Amino acid sequence: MGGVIKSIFTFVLIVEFIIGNLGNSFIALVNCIDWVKGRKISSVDRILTALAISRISLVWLIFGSWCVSVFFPALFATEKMFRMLTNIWTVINHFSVWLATGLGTFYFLKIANFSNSIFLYLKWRVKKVVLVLLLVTSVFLFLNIALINIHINASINGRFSSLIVLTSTVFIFIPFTLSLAMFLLLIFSMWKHRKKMQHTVKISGDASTKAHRGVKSVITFFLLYAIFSLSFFISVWTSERLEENLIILSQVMGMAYPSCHSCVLILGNKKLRQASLSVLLWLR
Amino acid sequence: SELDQLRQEAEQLKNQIRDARKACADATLSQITNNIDPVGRIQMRTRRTLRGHLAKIYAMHWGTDSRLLVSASQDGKLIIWDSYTTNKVHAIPLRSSWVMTCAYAPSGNYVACGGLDNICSIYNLKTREGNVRVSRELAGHTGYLSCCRFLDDNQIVTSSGDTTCALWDIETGQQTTTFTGHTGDVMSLSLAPDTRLFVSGACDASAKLWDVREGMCRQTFTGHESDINAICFFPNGNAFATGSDDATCRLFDLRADQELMTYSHDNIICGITSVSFSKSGRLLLAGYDDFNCNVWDALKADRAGVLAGHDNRVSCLGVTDDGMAVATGSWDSFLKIWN
């Protein structure tokens, strides 16, 4: 039972390593080709290639951790490698997820339309706001590193993964909840605008270019939020309840976001979709 | 009856001038310069890139000191640059943001601009206050100003889209001479080096040699098949080059009164926005809207180089008085100095 489950999870980890490496490499490579072949780069493209680089680093960290654990368990048992892997993972993961929330704040401040004065003050200073969001949220990183190191010291003075995983998962929930709140507020703004443009202005005489192209991105984004909050709840409940196969499952769950969210980001950027179509054209 | 007789007389005079220009056509410029040494390849490189404009550049003009250049853009700005150090001397805010031409006075004391407001505004750079203020607003044109060129501190020649070139007196504010012989919109101007006569390329596929003092057209040059957007004298003053929308550049001789050479390629299917000659007259630099500039051998009609490096349509370019540098402006809000 345990052996076939571990084999299935190993196959899952190999598949998601392949998908994540291919997707994030595709994002970074497309932006790099567009940069070297004399073309303009938007700010969204810079944030996207920052996410791609960070997610390549994170998926390589977890795959290298799995390679070290499988090939050299004696090396894996040491406290030095464990503490080094834990701290490097938490730094890279904090940077990656807060860059994703920064991209979400960029979208929300650029697109959404509200009458509040504070919202407009943030709305006309988007670059300053995302830079401040990256710099201020380092207090979360310092407190996370502190609490994980306290847990490591307590474990080696009493390896306590049942609290390490819980602390890390709590520290991923805050940017996820901020991104979900910004997404819901953007959807509410678009719905209010649609209700306004459906009763004063007779919609359009064309009715072609509108949110009818963005509903595909909204649908493929809300699907990812649903199927990832489900896996949030499943992983937290299973890690809390009784599991003793925690390492491979947690190594699988840590690679889920940087592998699937890049594929979601491909389906939803016009440049990335055009590059994917050109790749599928010249491959044939 | 009388109209038909006058039309027949006009056709007779047109056939007479065509036969007269055929009789003085013994050889061709391509045949005569077929035994001269061709220049190999002009490899110019971007030295300074001038940043600061936020909309598309429509015009630049060099100074007579070959260091100061003024640029015009749709952001309502007229920036005077120091080309050696790449820094801004002045930033003049225009009353109308729809500028289509800019000029630099030979003394350096004034700059001009104009466009869709039909006003040639002249700015005083050397004032006792530290600002650049408006000296005059010359308003007599019906259509948009396309080009302006300074004769001296008191005279300026403006080309407009109301089928009219005008010569102004800045102190009085009135126009002294009106040049009215064209049929379409006049798009380009070029003053001769002796500053006594000028050519104007219009939208009737014609270029006309005007006399400043006399006020009458002397020659008409009809070779193009589309709108002439650019015109520039040879340094000798006895020839000029025209850049049109039929993807061809042509060299016209004043004394022979016809076309000597066509600068065309089959790979170019887009118009010419700006033309400029070298100091020696050997290189003709033409700015195209295929995003780059082409260097032509003016005596052999062969491309010698490409000034690629602009991400949009190269709208304006000019060679300095000493011939050291070529500055190209384009719609991507950048000015690049080549050498």
Binding site: - | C24, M44, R255, S278, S280, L283
Partner: protein, 55 residues
């Protein structure tokens, strides 16, 4: 229409009485100017970096 036609006839008559030269003389004069001023042309013959104002 009569005045415009008369002006066109007068302009075409004034443009006909022009002392014309051959294409050979014009080509020779342009070639002579380009050969005479060839040394003082930085774009044709590139100057060294010591005397180049844009280095």
């Amino acid at each position: 229409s009569i005045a415009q036609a008369r002006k066109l006839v007068e302009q075409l008559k004034m443009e006909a009485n022009i002392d014309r030269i051959k294409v050979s003389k014009a080509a020779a004069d342009l070639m002579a100017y380009c050969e005479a001023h060839a040394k003082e042309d930085p774009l044709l013959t590139p100057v060294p970096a010591s005397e180049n104002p844009f280095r």
